[PDB]
Amino acid sequence: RLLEDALIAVRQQTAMMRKFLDTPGKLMDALKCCSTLVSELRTSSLSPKQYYELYMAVFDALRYLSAHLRENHPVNHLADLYELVQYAGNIIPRLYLMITVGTAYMSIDGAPVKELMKDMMDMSRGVQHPVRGLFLRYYLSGQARDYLPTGDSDGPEGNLQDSINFILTNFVEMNKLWVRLQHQGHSRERDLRTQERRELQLLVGSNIVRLS
Amino acid sequence: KAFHSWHSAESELMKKKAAQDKLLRQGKTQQDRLNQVNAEVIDAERKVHQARL
Amino acid sequence: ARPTFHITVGDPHKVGDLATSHIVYSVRTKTTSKAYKQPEFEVKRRYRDFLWLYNTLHSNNPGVVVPPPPEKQAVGRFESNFVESRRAALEKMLNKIAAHPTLQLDADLKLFLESESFNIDVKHKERKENKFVEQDDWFHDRRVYLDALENQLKALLKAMDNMVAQRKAMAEAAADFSASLHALSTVELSPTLSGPLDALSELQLAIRDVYERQAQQDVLTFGIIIEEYIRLIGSVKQAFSQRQKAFHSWHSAESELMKKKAAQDKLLRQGKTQQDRLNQVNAEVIDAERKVHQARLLFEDMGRLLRSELDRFEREKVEDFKSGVETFLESAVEAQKELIEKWETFLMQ
Amino acid sequence: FSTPVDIDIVLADADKRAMVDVKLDKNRREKVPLYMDGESVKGCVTVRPKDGKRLEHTGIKVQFIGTIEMFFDRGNHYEFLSLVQELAAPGELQHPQTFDFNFKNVEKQYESYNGINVKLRYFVRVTVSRRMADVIREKDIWVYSYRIPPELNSSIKMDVGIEDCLHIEFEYSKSKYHLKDVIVGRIYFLLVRLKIKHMELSIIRRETTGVAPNQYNESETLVRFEIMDGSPSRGETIPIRLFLGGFDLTPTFRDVNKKFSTRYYLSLVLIDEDARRYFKQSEIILYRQPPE
C-alpha cells in the first residue's frame, strides 16, 4: 500500500520539482520544492526495497537537476552557496543540496575542490543509518565520479592520492553501512536484510569498477 | 444663519436617505419612487455642498 | 500562538430533554498560545455561557469584531446536528477569534476556556467584582454601503429557505416513485423486463438520496455563513452607535465650555468681582477645555478604530466567502458524480 | 477640515544613507535609516500648512530620543538619551516654513530591538506647542552596535552523560559567533546503551526582562536542525555544520541599561525510540561584525 501512496505523492511533486530544477534562477525554487520532497525519503519506515525504489525515482528526477547544475555552475557561481544551502533543515535534503553545490564547484573549479570534498566526507561520517547514507553516498558517488581528485575525473590540485583515500573511506564505509545493515533495523528482520543486502551490494561494485 | 440653513440641508438629506433605506428593506420597492426619492436626495446633496461652500 | 491555539469542542454532554436543554461540551483548549494559560484546559460549557461570552467578546471589543456565536436554536431543535452546528459555530467562532489575537485576549475568555465554571462567575471575578463635513460624510457613506450589504444578505437568506424547502419533493416524491415502480416489478417475472424495471426503481431512490442530500450539502453551508454575517453587521451597528455617543459627548462638552467661558467674561466685565472668585471660574473654564480635549481626542481614536474594524471586516469577508464557494464546489461535483456512477450502473442495467 | 499643519522630517544624507529592516508583530517588516554610535543627526523639519488660516503656537522644538519600553506600558518608558533643539519661539504660522537642525556627535549606546516584553527604539520627535493640544511627529531610526573579532574565542568542549547509559563528548568551534557565522562542531560517542532515533541541534533565544525577583523570561526556539538519523555505537563521530545566516538572529544583549537581556543558547537534543529526550544547553554569544 505504503509504497504507492508515497509514489503518487512523488509523481506530482517531482514534476513540480523538475520544472524548477530545469530553470536557472528557479534553480532556487527547485530547492524549496525539493525541500518539501526529501522528507519522504526522510520517512522512517519503508522496505529497503521500497525505499530503494523511491531512491531511483527521486534520484533520477534529480539527475536532470545534476545535468542542469553542471550547466548552471558554468553560467555562474552565486557564492558560498554550498554553505548557504545547508541551512536546509534536515539532513538528507540539506546534504544533497550541499552536494549538488559541491558538484557545481567541481565543475568550474579544481583547487578548492579537494578541501570541500573532504568536508563532505566528514560530514559523511555522519550517516550511521546504513541505507540513508548508502543511497546518499551512492548518489554522491555518481556526483563526484566525474570529479574525483585525480586525472580520470579531471586531475585536481593533489591527484590520485586524495582520491584513493576518499574511495577507501567510502569503501570502509560501504562495509560499515552494509554490515551495520545486517544488524540495522529491527532484530528479527535478518532474511529481509539478506535479500535486500544483496541488492545494494551491487551498487558498491560500481565503485570498484570506478577503480578499475 | 448660513450655518442654520446648511444644517437644515443636511438634516433634510438624512431624512430623505433614511426613507430610501426603509423602502429598500421592505424588499420590493417600486422603481418610480426609488428614482424620485433618489433624485431629491441628489438635489439635497447639492444643497448641502453649496451651503457648506 | 494566537492562531496557534488548539480547540476541540467535544463531549456532547447533551443534557437530556427539557425541550430547550443545553448541551455542554468539553472545550478543550490545548493551546500553545501564550494568550491561554493552560497548555490544556477543558471546560464544559453550556450554550448559554457561550452566547453570553460571545456577546462579551462583543462587549470588550468596541467595533473590533465578533464573528457569529455558538449555533442558534432559532431554527435549531436540539438536533445532534444542530448542537453540532453549535459546537461548530463555536468552534469556528473560537477558531477565528483565536486567530485574531484580540478577541482571543478577552480575559473572561481565558478564564472561560481555561476554567469550567461558566462565563458568569469569571465575569464577576474579572472586574474585581476633524471637520464637520468629513465625519458626517464617513457616517452617510458607511450607512449607504453597509445598508446595501444587509439587503443583499437578507435577499440571499430567503433564497436559502426556498432552496432547502424545494428539495422535499422531487426527493420525497421519488421515494414513493421507487416503491410504485418496485411494486409492478413483482408482477413482471420475465427476466429482461423485470430486471430493468427494478433497476429503474433503484434509480428513483438514487435521485431521491442525492437530491435531498443537497439541502444539507450546499444550502446549509451558506445559511450558516449568511447568518454569521448578519450578526456581525448587527454588532458593528453597536460600534457605530458608540461613536454617535462620543459625538454627543464632544459637542456637549463644547456647548458647556462656551457657556463657562461666557459666565467668566460677564463676571469679569461686571468689574466688581474680586480676583479670588475670578480664579475659581477661570480654573473651571480651563477644566472644561480638558473635558473638550479628552472627549474630542478619544472620539478621533474611536473613528480610527471604526476605520480599522471596517478594513478588518472587509478582509475577513473575502476569505470566508472564498471558503464558502470552495466547500460548495466540492459538494456540487460529489452530488453529480454520485448520479453519474448510478447512471452507469443502470445503463449497464 | 483635517489637520491645519503636517510635519515632515528629511535628513541631509537621505539619498546616500543606508536603511535597515526590523521584524515587528505578525510578520511586519519596517524599514528606517541606519545609524551608529558617534554619528551626527542633521536635516530639516518641513512644515506643510494645509488650510489658509493661522496657527498660534508657544514654541517649536525637535528632540532626538532613545528609549526603552517595557510590557506595552507607557508609564514604564525610560529615555536613556534626550537631546533638544529649539527651532522657534512663541508666534504664528501662516505659510510653509522649513527649519534646519543638527545634533552633534550623538551618543547611541545600545542597538535597537523589538522583542516580546521589551522595545528599544530611537526616533526624532518634532513638537509644535499649542494652548491645549500639541502637534507631534515622530520619525523612527535604527541604530546598530558593532564589534571587532574577540581577543579570546575559546572552543566549547565538554563530556556529558546519563550515567552507565549514554556518555558523549561534544565540541563547538567557538564561544562567540558573528550573525553570519557557522557552527562547526562534532559529537563523539563514548558509551551508548540506549536506542537513539535521532539527534538535533537547537538555537534557543531567551529574552530576560526586569530587575531582581521581578524577572520574566520569554523563550523562543529559532531552529531545530537534525544532525543525526539513527543509532550510533561507541567511537562514532557525527559532524555539525550549522549556518547562522539562515535564521536572522539579533546580537547577544547583556543587562541593557540594567533592564533586559537577550541571550542565545545551543541546545543539543537526543531522542530515543520510546520518545525519551536527553539534552544539554550551552550559551553562545552572538555579535554584529563591523564591515571593513
Side-chain angles (χ1 to χ4, degrees):
Chain A
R1 180 198 80 218
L2 338 168
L3 181 51
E4 318 94 73
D5 317 324
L7 287 171
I8 287 157
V10 167
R11 286 168 275 262
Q12 333 118 354
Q13 305 310 116
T14 52
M16 292 191 68
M17 130 195 168
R18 287 174 298 226
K19 93 201 157 82
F20 306 134
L21 302 175
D22 299 336
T23 309
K26 314 298 176 182
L27 166 74
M28 294 71 135
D29 313 0
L31 323 182
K32 208 273 126 59
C33 179
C34 296
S35 307
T36 325
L37 172 62
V38 189
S39 322
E40 314 356 295
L41 326 174
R42 302 208 59 48
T43 193
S44 177
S45 41
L46 296 172
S47 309
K49 178 54 185 53
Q50 286 182 135
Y51 271 132
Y52 186 41
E53 304 340 292
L54 279 75
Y55 171 39
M56 299 92 211
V58 301
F59 166 69
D60 298 312
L62 297 158
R63 291 304 186 178
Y64 285 103
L65 174 62
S66 62
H68 165 72
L69 181 47
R70 289 174 307 214
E71 153 284 308
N72 228 287
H73 210 268
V75 305
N76 167 138
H77 181 28
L78 297 169
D80 319 302
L81 163 66
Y82 182 122
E83 169 261 4
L84 199 30
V85 287
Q86 307 307 92
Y87 309 164
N90 224 43
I91 192 161
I92 298 295
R94 179 186 26 239
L95 280 159
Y96 288 60
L97 297 156
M98 153 176 66
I99 292 161
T100 42
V101 196
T103 308
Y105 289 14
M106 299 156 163
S107 180
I108 206 65
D109 308 301
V113 181
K114 114 199 74 173
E115 302 90 307
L116 301 165
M117 189 225 199
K118 300 316 181 294
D119 169 81
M120 295 141 116
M121 220 308 297
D122 315 327
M123 321 323 279
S124 199
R125 305 180 303 153
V127 193
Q128 315 294 252
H129 185 269
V131 189
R132 281 219 229 295
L134 276 157
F135 293 169
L136 165 42
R137 278 199 184 231
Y138 220 74
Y139 131 64
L140 173 60
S141 295
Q143 290 282 62
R145 189 164 275 216
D146 344 277
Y147 303 105
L148 309 165
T150 204
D152 277 59
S153 275
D154 351 70
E157 191 198 7
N159 50 288
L160 191 46
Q161 313 86 359
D162 5 309
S163 337
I164 277 184
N165 309 333
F166 220 81
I167 302 173
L168 291 162
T169 58
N170 312 337
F171 111 62
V172 290
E173 266 270 24
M174 285 141 169
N175 140 93
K176 306 177 187 50
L177 301 123
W178 206 22
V179 177
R180 174 166 73 256
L181 229 155
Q182 184 52 266
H183 305 94
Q184 199 75 356
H186 185 61
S187 59
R188 308 280 69 227
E189 300 171 338
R190 215 145 285 275
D191 274 289
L192 289 180
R193 288 176 291 199
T194 66
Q195 335 96 4
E196 294 162 287
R197 269 194 51 143
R198 281 103 45 170
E199 310 161 352
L200 311 184
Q201 82 197 356
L202 313 176
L203 316 182
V204 195
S206 60
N207 308 87
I208 315 192
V209 141
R210 199 28 180 122
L211 288 149
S212 37
Chain B
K1 187 178 213 274
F3 175 35
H4 119 258
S5 303
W6 175 38
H7 181 61
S8 302
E10 295 176 316
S11 301
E12 168 178 336
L13 181 55
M14 283 284 165
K15 285 178 195 325
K16 285 196 180 161
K17 189 67 63 63
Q20 196 160 348
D21 302 314
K22 188 55 177 65
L23 307 183
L24 245 67
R25 278 177 283 135
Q26 306 169 351
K28 294 295 162 160
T29 303
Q30 191 172 53
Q31 51 282 118
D32 292 321
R33 316 171 304 168
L34 196 75
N35 288 309
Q36 282 169 45
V37 70
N38 192 49
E40 288 193 73
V41 150
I42 306 168
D43 296 2
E45 161 172 0
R46 292 185 291 106
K47 283 161 208 165
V48 162
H49 158 45
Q50 291 175 281
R52 172 77 286 277
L53 187 53
Chain C
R2 306 305 175 264
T4 331
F5 173 66
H6 336 95
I7 177 73
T8 296
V9 180
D11 312 334
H13 166 89
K14 329 190 169 65
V15 212
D17 200 59
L18 275 179
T20 189
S21 40
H22 66 160
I23 184 173
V24 183
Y25 302 107
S26 46
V27 167
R28 275 164 293 297
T29 54
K30 2 276 155 298
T31 161
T32 190
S33 198
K34 260 62 172 190
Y36 287 107
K37 307 185 288 286
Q38 322 289 168
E40 155 62 38
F41 207 78
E42 201 186 289
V43 310
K44 255 205 75 59
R45 293 298 178 221
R46 333 204 149 218
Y47 182 35
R48 41 171 193 100
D49 314 303
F50 307 112
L51 288 157
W52 176 254
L53 176 265
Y54 166 61
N55 316 141
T56 324
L57 308 169
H58 218 143
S59 320
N60 318 322
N61 304 111
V64 199
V65 66
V66 274
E71 198 83 307
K72 308 309 302 176
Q73 222 151 11
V75 270
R77 284 61 46 194
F78 189 27
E79 224 127 297
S80 187
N81 321 326
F82 159 55
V83 299
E84 164 56 66
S85 316
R86 179 195 289 163
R87 189 181 298 140
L90 288 154
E91 161 284 311
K92 171 185 60 152
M93 160 191 109
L94 292 163
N95 163 296
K96 294 160 174 301
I97 60 191
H100 302 141
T102 312
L103 289 313
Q104 194 186 6
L105 291 195
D106 301 319
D108 199 297
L109 172 68
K110 297 173 187 172
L111 301 159
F112 197 56
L113 279 170
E114 305 186 293
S115 324
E116 152 54 60
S117 62
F118 306 110
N119 214 72
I120 302 98
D121 312 294
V122 167
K123 187 50 190 175
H124 307 107
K125 285 168 182 61
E126 54 211 49
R127 305 142 293 163
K128 71 176 299 185
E129 66 195 79
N130 78 299
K131 185 57 54 191
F132 216 84
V133 177
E134 296 197 337
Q135 52 193 52
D136 286 10
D137 291 22
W138 186 247
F139 300 163
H140 77 204
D141 192 275
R142 191 175 153 96
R143 194 63 177 176
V144 168
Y145 178 26
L146 198 62
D147 285 7
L149 311 174
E150 193 46 49
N151 296 288
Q152 292 145 350
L153 288 170
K154 177 170 64 57
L156 281 156
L157 204 55
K158 300 299 141 297
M160 303 301 107
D161 296 327
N162 284 356
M163 293 151 66
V164 168
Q166 197 59 55
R167 300 300 160 260
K168 171 161 47 77
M170 198 180 185
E172 199 194 68
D176 297 292
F177 192 28
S178 37
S180 196
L181 281 185
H182 263 310
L184 187 99
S185 312
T186 314
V187 181
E188 294 197 318
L189 291 180
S190 312
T192 55
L193 286 100
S194 31
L197 192 64
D198 280 290
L200 195 69
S201 305
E202 285 296 316
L203 211 159
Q204 313 317 315
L205 193 88
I207 291 173
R208 111 62 47 183
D209 30 80
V210 175
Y211 204 38
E212 189 62 61
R213 205 163 66 200
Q214 293 165 283
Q216 287 81 232
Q217 288 187 276
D218 302 289
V219 205
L220 179 53
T221 296
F222 291 152
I224 294 182
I225 76 163
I226 295 160
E227 283 178 275
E228 181 57 78
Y229 299 130
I230 282 166
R231 67 176 67 119
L232 293 162
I233 291 176
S235 208
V236 307
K237 226 80 72 176
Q238 315 299 114
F240 183 65
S241 298
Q242 291 175 35
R243 276 76 216 162
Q244 299 304 86
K245 314 194 200 279
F247 174 46
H248 191 25
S249 297
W250 158 85
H251 57 79
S252 296
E254 213 183 350
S255 71
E256 192 67 66
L257 178 50
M258 282 147 70
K259 294 172 168 70
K260 253 166 172 186
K261 182 190 56 46
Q264 191 265 119
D265 52 85
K266 300 300 194 297
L267 278 166
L268 195 51
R269 305 171 316 221
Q270 196 69 53
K272 275 175 176 179
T273 311
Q274 60 166 14
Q275 304 284 122
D276 206 55
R277 290 188 298 191
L278 281 164
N279 289 352
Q280 288 171 298
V281 186
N282 285 13
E284 297 180 52
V285 188
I286 316 284
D287 290 83
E289 301 186 292
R290 291 195 271 267
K291 296 199 270 181
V292 177
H293 167 67
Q294 279 172 245
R296 172 65 268 185
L297 178 63
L298 291 178
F299 187 34
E300 196 69 78
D301 300 313
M302 278 174 93
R304 290 299 151 279
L305 286 167
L306 182 56
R307 269 161 188 85
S308 299
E309 167 182 67
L310 184 57
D311 305 311
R312 272 170 57 71
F313 181 49
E314 290 166 296
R315 164 185 64 63
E316 290 159 358
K317 190 172 184 64
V318 168
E319 295 170 75
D320 198 11
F321 190 40
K322 186 172 186 191
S323 314
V325 179
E326 180 174 354
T327 302
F328 178 92
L329 196 73
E330 293 162 295
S331 280
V333 67
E334 175 178 314
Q336 190 194 275
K337 163 165 162 198
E338 180 70 306
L339 302 169
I340 282 167
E341 286 172 284
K342 292 287 168 52
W343 292 350
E344 286 169 15
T345 290
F346 310 127
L347 189 183
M348 286 164 48
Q349 307 286 323
Chain D
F1 294 126
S2 199
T3 52
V5 69
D6 292 343
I7 303 167
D8 201 47
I9 295 148
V10 178
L11 300 159
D13 54 10
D15 298 340
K16 291 181 179 178
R17 184 175 287 279
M19 298 187 93
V20 170
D21 290 3
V22 187
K23 48 151 186 296
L24 284 76
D25 305 326
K26 301 182 180 179
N27 301 324
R28 297 179 291 166
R29 296 179 65 91
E30 294 178 315
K31 187 170 61 170
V32 293
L34 186 62
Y35 300 82
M36 64 188 86
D37 200 5
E39 284 181 294
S40 296
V41 183
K42 66 181 183 180
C44 186
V45 179
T46 294
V47 177
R48 296 176 297 167
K50 299 305 198 184
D51 282 309
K53 297 169 195 161
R54 62 185 187 175
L55 165 48
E56 197 187 311
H57 62 86
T58 53
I60 310 181
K61 62 184 178 183
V62 62
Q63 298 173 320
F64 178 92
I65 295 172
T67 188
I68 291 168
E69 305 172 7
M70 295 177 288
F71 301 108
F72 303 95
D73 174 9
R74 289 180 179 171
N76 265 320
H77 296 189
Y78 181 79
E79 301 184 354
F80 56 90
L81 296 160
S82 180
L83 301 173
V84 195
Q85 294 175 70
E86 304 302 326
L87 298 169
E92 281 194 8
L93 288 165
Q94 296 180 342
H95 289 293
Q97 186 60 58
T98 51
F99 296 95
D100 301 326
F101 70 88
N102 191 337
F103 295 102
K104 184 182 180 179
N105 300 340
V106 183
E107 296 189 1
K108 311 179 203 64
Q109 296 178 337
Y110 309 132
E111 175 159 296
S112 297
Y113 174 67
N114 189 77
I116 302 298
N117 289 321
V118 187
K119 300 181 183 184
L120 195 157
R121 52 181 274 261
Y122 292 83
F123 53 97
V124 176
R125 186 168 70 188
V126 175
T127 305
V128 178
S129 188
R130 290 193 299 186
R131 187 151 174 167
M132 290 301 294
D134 288 2
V135 180
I136 298 170
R137 182 72 174 175
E138 303 201 344
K139 180 72 173 183
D140 295 77
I141 291 180
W142 182 272
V143 171
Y144 62 106
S145 66
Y146 62 88
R147 180 186 173 169
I148 68 171
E151 179 186 4
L152 300 174
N153 208 349
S154 192
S155 61
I156 303 176
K157 193 180 194 196
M158 252 195 83
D159 187 357
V160 295
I162 303 302
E163 275 298 19
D164 288 297
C165 286
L166 183 73
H167 301 157
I168 64 169
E169 175 172 52
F170 65 84
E171 194 169 13
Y172 309 132
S173 64
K174 311 177 181 181
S175 287
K176 302 158 197 180
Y177 292 94
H178 55 85
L179 297 179
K180 291 176 286 187
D181 212 341
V182 186
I183 314 301
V184 182
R186 63 184 177 176
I187 309 301
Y188 184 55
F189 285 90
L190 293 159
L191 182 74
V192 187
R193 288 171 173 160
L194 297 174
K195 314 181 213 199
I196 299 161
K197 183 176 180 179
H198 95 268
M199 179 168 58
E200 67 187 71
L201 188 64
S202 171
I203 296 163
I204 287 173
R205 179 179 70 186
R206 180 176 292 167
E207 181 186 288
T208 299
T209 306
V211 179
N214 183 1
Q215 183 179 342
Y216 294 91
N217 297 291
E218 192 73 2
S219 287
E220 187 175 310
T221 305
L222 289 167
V223 61
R224 297 175 66 199
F225 185 77
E226 182 177 50
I227 53 170
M228 191 181 66
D229 167 18
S231 193
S233 57
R234 69 180 180 86
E236 197 76 53
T237 295
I238 305 299
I240 301 171
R241 196 194 293 140
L242 174 57
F243 294 93
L244 291 172
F247 297 97
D248 195 44
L249 307 178
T250 72
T252 294
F253 297 122
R254 200 69 172 88
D255 307 303
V256 179
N257 200 233
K258 298 135 170 51
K259 297 198 169 58
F260 74 103
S261 270
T262 298
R263 295 215 275 176
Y264 290 87
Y265 297 92
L266 290 176
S267 187
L268 180 68
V269 186
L270 295 85
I271 295 173
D272 86 355
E273 299 292 13
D274 291 319
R276 304 181 262 269
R277 319 179 93 263
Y278 306 87
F279 66 99
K280 185 60 171 64
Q281 203 165 111
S282 196
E283 197 171 314
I284 56 165
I285 287 74
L286 303 184
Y287 62 97
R288 190 180 293 281
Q289 183 65 50
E292 294 264 297

